[PDB]
């Protein structure tokens, strides 16, 4: 519980960390969908979220539990999955870090 969310917390410091930086840097802050020109993310993407708002949260004790936590990192790349073309530079980074959460999220207490 307290200990399961100290496991969370050291994953996000992972995947914020630079160790894997080269492909999780996209993930880092809220899709600025307007100065990318994305006048359509907002239409197909309902809740956005990204690793920035995980860490205000995990700080502020939104997240009961583990699961709580790993929805939201979880919702973060299927929003990527749902918005890219499969074949996309960011869904292949995205996959790369989602395997990086999921191999270390297994290793829960």
């Given at each position: ?54 860490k205000r949260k995990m700080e502020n004790r ?48």
């Amino acid at each position: 519980l307290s200990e399961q969310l100290k496991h969370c917390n050291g994953i996000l410091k992972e995947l914020l960390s630079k160790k894997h930086a080269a492909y999780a840097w996209p993930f880092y802050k809220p899709v600025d969908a307007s100065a990318l020109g994305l006048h359509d993310y907002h239409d197909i993407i309902k809740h956005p979220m990204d690793l920035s708002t995980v860490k205000r949260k995990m700080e502020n004790r939104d997240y009961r539990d583990a699961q709580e936590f790993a929805a939201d990192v979880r919702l973060m790349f299927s929003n990527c999955y749902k918005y890219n073309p499969p074949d996309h530079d960011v869904v292949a980074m995205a996959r790369k870090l989602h395997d990086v959460f999921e191999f270390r999220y297994a290793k829960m207490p």
